[PDB]
Symmetry: D2
Subunit: 158 residues, 4 copies
Amino acid sequence: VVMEEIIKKAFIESINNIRRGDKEEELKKIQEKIVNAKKIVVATNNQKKFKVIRDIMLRVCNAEIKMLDIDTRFADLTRMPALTKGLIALDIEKADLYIARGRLGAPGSGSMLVILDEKGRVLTASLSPSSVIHKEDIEERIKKELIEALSRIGISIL
Amino acid sequence: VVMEEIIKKAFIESINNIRRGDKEEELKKIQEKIVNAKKIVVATNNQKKFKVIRDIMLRVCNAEIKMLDIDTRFADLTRMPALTKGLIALDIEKADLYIARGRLGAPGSGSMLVILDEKGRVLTASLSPSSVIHKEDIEERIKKELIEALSRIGISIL
Amino acid sequence: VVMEEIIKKAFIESINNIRRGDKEEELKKIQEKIVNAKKIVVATNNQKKFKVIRDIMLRVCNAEIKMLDIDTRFADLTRMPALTKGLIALDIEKADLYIARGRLGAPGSGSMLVILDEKGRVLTASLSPSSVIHKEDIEERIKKELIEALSRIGISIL
Amino acid sequence: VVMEEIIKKAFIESINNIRRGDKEEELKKIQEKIVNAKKIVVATNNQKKFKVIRDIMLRVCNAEIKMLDIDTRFADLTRMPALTKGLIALDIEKADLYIARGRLGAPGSGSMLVILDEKGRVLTASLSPSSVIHKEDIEERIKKELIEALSRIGISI
Ligand SMILES: Cc1c(O)nc(CC(=O)O)c(C)c1OP(=O)(O)OC[C@H]1O[C@@H](n2cnc3c(=O)[nH]c(N)nc32)[C@H](O)[C@@H]1O
Ligand SMILES: Cc1c(O)nc(CC(=O)O)c(C)c1OP(=O)(O)OC[C@H]1O[C@@H](n2cnc3c(=O)[nH]c(N)nc32)[C@H](O)[C@@H]1O
Ligand SMILES: Cc1c(O)nc(CC(=O)O)c(C)c1OP(=O)(O)OC[C@H]1O[C@@H](n2cnc3c(=O)[nH]c(N)nc32)[C@H](O)[C@@H]1O
Ligand SMILES: Cc1c(O)nc(CC(=O)O)c(C)c1OP(=O)(O)OC[C@H]1O[C@@H](n2cnc3c(=O)[nH]c(N)nc32)[C@H](O)[C@@H]1O
């Protein structure tokens, strides 16, 4: 069953007041989309971030993985910058999966890393506390963020 | 300074490539908006979810706290249901803060609790894994979500 | 060239501040997307709305055109109901093009017809005044809306 | 009523499947928000665009009307740049209304002018064809878009 047919079913359940939350078939399709991704685009031009992401993703799938040629810092003027960055990458590059990391919402709100599919659907995300608070190396932070975004949909890096 | 003037500064930084993450003034402003709120709307008609949220928020601020008299489950046909739920409350109720909890993304993607201000800005949020995995009492889940959403922007419940 | 490449050039212009509005290549690519579409989904379960749009779209392309099995009225709790209806159709059906027609914005704001591409991108659109004013048959309104949305990107129905 | 209550009424009609389009009260309320605005922000730092919009809006209301100090062209990397410009101005300026004009959607998709209220709700909008086609002066174009955006919610200059 294709993702669209799985989502159709969820939407019908919601409309008709029988939706009881996420279902096993749905989680499985999510996992499948990530693990089976053949091409992955990371919505950054910052080589530091890219390498942390790429190395982890290589433990889970057999995709070609690349970053962007433009600076996505301008997403930082939007309401939800991490998400904006993911849709910028979706507009300019064809891929199976898009991974973005940046600010969650307003200045002050900490960070969000998000994984989108090829139509811009939010498959998974994870957040860190504002760097003003945690003060960890950005490298260690992104690593923890990616790993938690995967574990929360049943994907272990082993 | 006013929130709008704080955000203008952040935006100027990003436009001109000198933005080095969240700043103290920015964190402080968010905490202030939450701690000083006079009216809070919880973006549900579900009594159980409301009570859990309210009892916590009364530990941190002195607001009148109320829930909605419409079912926001129809948000579940949109891309980011939890955010959609916040913006429905924003459209139909006047408050200083809006709290919503729902599915993060596509079916299977787990949960998001989000706090929005007076103009729909994302102030903070937290996520839980797909209920398919964690399998916890929802009321215990929402407690953990709200406390982490507060703690990641410097607000302690104790 | 591929749409992604075209958009990348535009974004590059914008970043550098040499963007002087839409380009012939961009118009040509939009036209191509529409005229060459093989499958079109109308984001509605309303047979009247469907028939109007179908018969017009058949004058411009050789697609299979269908509607949905679910009522996309629930998009009418969101900020931008017409756009929300398009993104619901995108989530539940595969197609080259999605056409949605509903309320522009807040209650009282009149109507929007919008055409999206297979990744959710906005190709063209058109509006009618609020029905409280114009008082015309819905089918006559949708016909005029569609024909406008097509002529403003250089597509003639004649 | 307050706008929030008029909106709840409308949403309730929708949930129950009895919504039969816009209503006179909702249209009145939109007109009211526009004509009675005391402050308006034009979401641009472009003087020519600002001036065309200001001179028209001064015929409809008695507001203070101002533009931004930042270039909102960075909106042009998002899916719907005109709307994004609106919500940038909302984030950095208090006002009763916000007016933005820029590209509707994808490169090549033509223009949109939009008017948002103080919570970012979409009150009205208007579109022009791709400039590649109409080939008009941008100032004539914006005059026509604002006028149509006002006239479609019952506001005559
Ligand atoms: C509608 C919906 C959905 O499809 N998926 C999720 C993700 C997930 O299941 O983790 C959520 C949170 C959701 O939204 P909502 O907060 O409205 O949850 C709807 C229903 O889905 C089940 N559910 C949601 N979150 C939890 C949870 O944390 N624990 C348990 N036991 N059930 C849950 C409950 O029956 C609940 O009434
Ligand atoms: C632009 C931006 C922002 O204003 N705030 C935040 C939230 C926060 O500061 O916690 C983020 C994540 C952000 O986006 P981006 O991922 O582009 O990070 C921007 C810059 O802000 C700093 N920064 C962001 N996240 C971290 C972190 O986890 N650790 C450290 N040390 N610095 C960080 C770095 O200078 C980094 O290059
Ligand atoms: C950045 C941008 C774009 O890529 N496409 C469009 C649609 C279109 O070209 O029809 C617009 C409106 C736009 O946004 P903005 O209002 O910021 O226009 C950017 C530049 O694009 C040109 N332009 C935009 N609207 C018009 C117009 O109505 N007439 C003419 N001659 N040029 C125009 C001008 O050079 C202008 O400085
Ligand atoms: C839900 C909704 C709404 O509240 N307002 C508007 C703006 C407006 O009233 O002008 C629209 C377009 C709408 O969405 P939708 O296309 O789903 O219409 C819902 C119903 O609202 C009435 N309606 C909408 N557009 C027209 C129109 O162009 N002509 C007429 N006569 N009725 C209309 C019809 O009863 C229709 O069944």
